[PDB]
Amino acid sequence: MPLDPRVEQFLAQMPLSLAEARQQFKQGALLLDQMVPPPPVDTEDGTVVTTHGPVRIRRYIPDRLRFSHPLVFYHGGGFVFGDIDTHHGLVARLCQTVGATVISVDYSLAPEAKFPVPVAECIDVARWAAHEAPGWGLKPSIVVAGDSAGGNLAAVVSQRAKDESLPIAAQLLFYPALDMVHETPSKRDFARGYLLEADAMQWFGEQYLRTPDDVSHPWASPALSPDLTGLPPALVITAEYDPLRDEGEAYAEALRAAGVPTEQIRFDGMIHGFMTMPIFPQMEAAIEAVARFLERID
Template sequence: MALDRSTALVLKLMTAAYPDLGRTVTEASEARRLHALARFPEGPPMAGVREHTIAGSPDIPVRIYHPHTGRSPRPVLVYFHGGGFVLCGLDSHDGICRLLADGTGAVVVSVDYRRAPEHRFPAAVDDAYAAVRWVHRQAAELGADPARVAVAGDSAGGNLAAVACLLARERGTPPIAFQLLIYPVTDIMSTLPSRRENADGCFLTATHLRWFHEQYLTSPEEAAHPHASPLRAPSLADLPPALVVTAEYDPLRDEGEAYAARLAAAGVPAAVHRADGLFHGFFGMSAMLPAARATEHAACAALRAALVRDAPAVGEDGGPERWEASLPASDVRGTA
């Protein structure tokens, strides 16, 4: 593996801090306890951040970010965190959501979907789709434009974002303008080369993936369902345009790129941004991994191009120029 020295050091530190899933750590509760001890990347200040609960059966907690950048009504991005359908939550991905809100001028709604093994497939899928429908219906109350709703997610969250698009197509609503899939799980049964090439030593391992999938699925047969493995959907036509972010040293690399290729073959505008020299989990970590910054800028630029009307000029560093927002310049955090 040809990582530069600083990247290799970050990989070593992250691997040491991560629960030894599927080996010495087999219980989800213990995995979450250990994972919660980690420090997660911080993001830029927001004009406002608030907690909300989408009422339903079940209720779905969300965190809503209003950036200083952008003009109302803003586009809105529904974000699904990673964590193998088992770990992570609103706090672990707070920095990423702030980064995307600040970099696009969009309202970001981060979704605390139900996690496995307490709630197995398709519980997270149901929550993801319900959250996107709620955001579309409540867009005006969020200061957002219902015609400019996008979805995004990383890893397991990228899977949920992709599946939410499949469900929206199947059920005819809501309209989704764009999908940002960050090193997504697209085929739980994948045997593509990157699953072997990057099976160990790349932070996310084959053992981790096996453990995550055992927690998420009730039976192995469910892995073939398109709502668990969207790469196995019979058709990917008529889906929203997509940017798929992958990492060179990631077991999920090839299935993400295969998903983008199938989208393009089905007539869907789709692009791949491969982060060479990086590994799974890098997105949002540019403070520690400067090489991640180009990918973060590319993701924000793709979202702006797809969603932002009269988009602001891009500064020399690739970030959007800022202008004064109508929201109060305070970063208000409520209680979950």
């Protein structure tokens, strides 16, 4: 299907040390938020004790609480970039539109921390949230969510949940990375020029993984896991013109065939990253999809 017109315009107007690259990513997120301001939302900052150290979080409190599970949100950025502030535009909207409490997680970035450190942190924070939930007046089963690399983390946390005695009611995967081993058609065909590029993905992996063999570990490549039965209900949102599209959609099909309640939504004409790009109305459409999906959990 054609590229969305606003996406087309955005790609046409696109024009370092690690620190400079991280700063440039943050500046880009700020510019988009200046173009389309987030909704006001009450927040509280805190720090969770994990098995790998303190992890900063920010809890978002909706004006009106309508959803009975906490959400725990893991930002994207290739495992190397991003933070709570870069994803505030998305999380503020998830909070207020769903009417959910959301815990946004500042997990440890690569290459300073390597695989599987953030996976461990993200489990620990989910466990904390499940423990805290009743004192927030909520059910002790959590919803995990994330975009891109953060969607990878949400998927892995979900696969580990039973083994980790972690109660998870649903998983929300926004254009996740899920298979670092296999090339898919979308990975070949949309490899260059659609914001998320082949060269960058290679580099992100070099920063995150310890050795090349880690690509086949299921905590890096959750799509390789042979048994998906009994996993949490899943919303899998993809973008049509995204190298990661096909692995996302294939994982949704696999979940569905494993008896996992699954909703699979491709946003046509879109690119990777669209749910943190509020210049696109499809971002809010996708957040409405989240609210509608979560209405069905209880």
